[PDB]
Design a protein around this ligand. Sequence first.
Ligand SMILES: [Mg+2]
Ligand SMILES: [Mg+2]
Ligand SMILES: [Mg+2]
Ligand SMILES: [Mg+2]
Ligand SMILES: [Mg+2]
Ligand SMILES: [Mg+2]
Ligand SMILES: [Mg+2]
Ligand SMILES: [Mg+2]
Ligand SMILES: [Mg+2]
Ligand SMILES: [Mg+2]
Ligand SMILES: [Mg+2]
Ligand SMILES: [Mg+2]
Ligand SMILES: [Mg+2]
Ligand SMILES: [Mg+2]
Ligand SMILES: [Mg+2]
Ligand SMILES: [Mg+2]
Ligand SMILES: [Mg+2]
Ligand SMILES: [Mg+2]
Ligand SMILES: [Mg+2]
Ligand SMILES: [Mg+2]
Ligand SMILES: [Mg+2]
Ligand SMILES: [Mg+2]
Ligand SMILES: [Mg+2]
Ligand SMILES: [Zn+2]
Lengths: 25, 125, 95, 211, 64
Amino acid sequence: MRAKWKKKRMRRLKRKRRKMRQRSK
Amino acid sequence: VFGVAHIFASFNDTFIHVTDLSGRETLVRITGGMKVKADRDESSPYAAMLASQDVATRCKELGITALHIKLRATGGNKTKTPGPGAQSALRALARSGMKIGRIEDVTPVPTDSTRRKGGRRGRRL
Amino acid sequence: TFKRRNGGRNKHGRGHVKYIRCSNCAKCCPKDKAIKRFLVRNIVEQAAVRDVQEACVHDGYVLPKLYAKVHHCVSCAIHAHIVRVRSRENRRNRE
Amino acid sequence: PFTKKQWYDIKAPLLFTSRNVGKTLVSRTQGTKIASEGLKHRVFEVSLADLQNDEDQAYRKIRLRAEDVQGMNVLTNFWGMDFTTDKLRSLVRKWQTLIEAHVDVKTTDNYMLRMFAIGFTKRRPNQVKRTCYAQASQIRQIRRKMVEIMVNQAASCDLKELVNKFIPEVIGKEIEKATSSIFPLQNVYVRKVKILKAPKFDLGKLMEVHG
Amino acid sequence: DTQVKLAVVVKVMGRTGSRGQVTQVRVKFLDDQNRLIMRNVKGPVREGDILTLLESEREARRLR
RNA sequence: AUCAGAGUGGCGCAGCGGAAGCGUGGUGGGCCCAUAACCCACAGGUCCCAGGAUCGAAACCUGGCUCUGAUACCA
RNA sequence: UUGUUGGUCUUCAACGAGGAAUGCCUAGUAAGCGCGAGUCAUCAGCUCGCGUUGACUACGUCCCUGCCCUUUGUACACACCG
RNA sequence: GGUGAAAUUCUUGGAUUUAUGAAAGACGAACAACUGCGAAAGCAUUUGCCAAGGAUGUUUUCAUUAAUCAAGAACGAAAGUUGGGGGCUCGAAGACGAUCAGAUACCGUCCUAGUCUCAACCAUAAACGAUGCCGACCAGGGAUCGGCGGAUGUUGCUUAUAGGACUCCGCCGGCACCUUAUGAGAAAUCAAAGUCUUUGGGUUCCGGGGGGAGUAUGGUCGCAAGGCUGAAACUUAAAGGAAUUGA
Ligand SMILES: [Mg+2]
Ligand SMILES: [Mg+2]
Ligand SMILES: [Mg+2]
Ligand SMILES: [Mg+2]
Ligand SMILES: [Mg+2]
Ligand SMILES: [Mg+2]
Ligand SMILES: [Mg+2]
Ligand SMILES: [Mg+2]
Ligand SMILES: [Mg+2]
Ligand SMILES: [Mg+2]
Ligand SMILES: [Mg+2]
Ligand SMILES: [Mg+2]
Ligand SMILES: [Mg+2]
Ligand SMILES: [Mg+2]
Ligand SMILES: [Mg+2]
Ligand SMILES: [Mg+2]
Ligand SMILES: [Mg+2]
Ligand SMILES: [Mg+2]
Ligand SMILES: [Mg+2]
Ligand SMILES: [Mg+2]
Ligand SMILES: [Mg+2]
Ligand SMILES: [Mg+2]
Ligand SMILES: [Mg+2]
Ligand SMILES: [Zn+2]
């Protein structure tokens, strides 16, 4: 379900980016 | 003289189990897997008929002439239909020389069951 | 493209129909969509009826029938030849 | 291993025309596992066509419990009443309505028992309609009457004549005739009787019913 | 023990097998001319052949 | 320092005297339109070295050689 | 002449019915046997024909390899070696 | 036992099977439907109680009180979060057994969270009829559910009748279905997706080639997972819908 799995990939990457930004706090 | 023959003919095996009129004494219990060597063919009608002839011999030496038959599939939250050996067991206990008193089905059928193995998408092969 | 007008199932005026488990693979399939057959079959087939009819103690003994209501998912019913792919025109025939 | 077991003859009570249901076997009396009162509670499954020698009732499986053993003669009283599977699954059919009722009831001797009754609506002649359904309110009216009758007809002196109402289907056809200004209801039966609780032994009653 | 029984092909039904090498026939037992059962035979066979059966019980099914 | 352990196909390992392979790679064929997989073969070997015992040894005893692991306590 | 071919005597190799795979075949057929022609001065283990001796098995099936027609799915059209 | 075949597993401290009974938790088969109810999500054992609701009936009442809706608000499958209860079954993760060139998969076994329940969150689904709501007109037919009206003619019914069950006819209101263009449409199809270049009944939301991208950023809600709101640079000549002939 490549659209569903692409959505999961974007979800994962967005979580990672958020973690970098909150660590920068 | 009467004993009751519980034939549990599932897939993968068939049991011929003859017991008294209360189910409380085992006269002779022979299953399909006793008459073969390979696991694939325990359920085969051939094993069912060999087990049937053997229980026939063990029974006519015990004074019982006529058998009451209680057929069964696996039941529960699974298949309701008897396996490949159910028919052969009756055919051979009848042609071997014994009388059949009464036939009926005891497959456990839930009025509703617990969840069944496999998952939502089922066994997919 | 839309294959069928009923969407492949019999549901009008409802929102939700409870599912059932396929008799072959246990797949969850809603009740109105599954292929449902009621089988009334004999205890033994006619090649082996008489060598039990002669072994009945009682006169007039009638051998029972097994009754079972069997559900199949679309995949298992198609693969087991219970239902077949039909042509565009004969798909509409409900008889 | 079978040179250590004696047979016993099982006898049903006199409300059943034909008697002497069959033969059981127990293992020879050894102290501590003496057979006589060691077992004393076997349950047996016998059709009603073997107990009344009419084949129009080969359904209606009778379940008989052993209450006493008299020297190679196992005395037996009535324990339960059921259908056979083929009978029940012949009765339920699409395009018709099934009505179910049940009730807990006492007889004059302290026997608690549960009755389950089943019925199905009857299509008439000249009916052109393709189904025969009641309206879940007629369903309720029938089920109310069904329990009413089932409790008024029971709670009579003893299981003796209660089973004498079960044998000729007094309950069933009384229920049919009672609910005909509600809905016709073919094939009305008492599908099951499970006795909920058996009070005590009462040895004299057992020979009052036996023979 | 088993005793070889003797049967007669009374009608021939069809050709089973993956490669059609087996025929299905209905046989009739000469001692008991009332027991007609389905069997599978290998080799050419017409109506009227006499088949020797090592065991009698095994009975084939339609389009086996 | 003394002792227990391991040396066998180009590599890793199994081998209970009657006595040599497993796995993986090598070469040649087969299958396929072709490539992998897969199938069949053919070539491989101081069984770590020297003695001995024994119908009979890569194995059993001894002795020398190379690698691994160990006990090394009261001042 | 790295022997055209045919003779004579002598020399006496592998080969013990052949692994995986694989081909052709349904009656005067397969297989065995020889003969003719083409090539040709000379050279036939080849090809194209011809007779002679003459079977086993089957009289099916769609399992494998494919072929024809229909229905069906398709994101293929250099078309699934897509 | 399980499977295409097996193995892991259990088993002479007796497995699987049989019989009677008890405990536990979950589920509510068959009946069960081109059927019902609900705003949707959803709702299937009995009986009792509580409030609610549509339709029908009506020579009851009010008299324009109405339609659709920024803001704002209730409800909202499953999974998920926090804490109690529970803990049968099935079972993400995980551990093994197989299969394979590998197999972090399909298949088999054992199973954790979960599945059930209470209190509080979450606010998303192919949440689909992929079709917002109110109103009018427009074609034929037979079924079916609810209510009502009218019919003689029969019930294993009913002190007689009336009524209940069935039959026939009609009217409202539902869920749908079948046949047909005089219609519409790119067609598939649609009796509403018709009454459109002969274009105007009312109203809300929402689209403007494919990507980048539901991404970055700011705000806001959430315990969290995440929800709502939501770009640009850059890139690209097609992406796409329906149908046809082939393979
Ligand atoms: Mg509705
Ligand atoms: Mg839904
Ligand atoms: Mg090679
Ligand atoms: Mg290759
Ligand atoms: Mg030349
Ligand atoms: Mg020549
Ligand atoms: Mg040439
Ligand atoms: Mg498809
Ligand atoms: Mg499609
Ligand atoms: Mg293209
Ligand atoms: Mg490809
Ligand atoms: Mg046991
Ligand atoms: Mg209903
Ligand atoms: Mg139910
Ligand atoms: Mg795993
Ligand atoms: Mg959404
Ligand atoms: Mg939408
Ligand atoms: Mg909507
Ligand atoms: Mg009506
Ligand atoms: Mg209507
Ligand atoms: Mg534009
Ligand atoms: Mg755009
Ligand atoms: Mg297309
Ligand atoms: Zn299935």
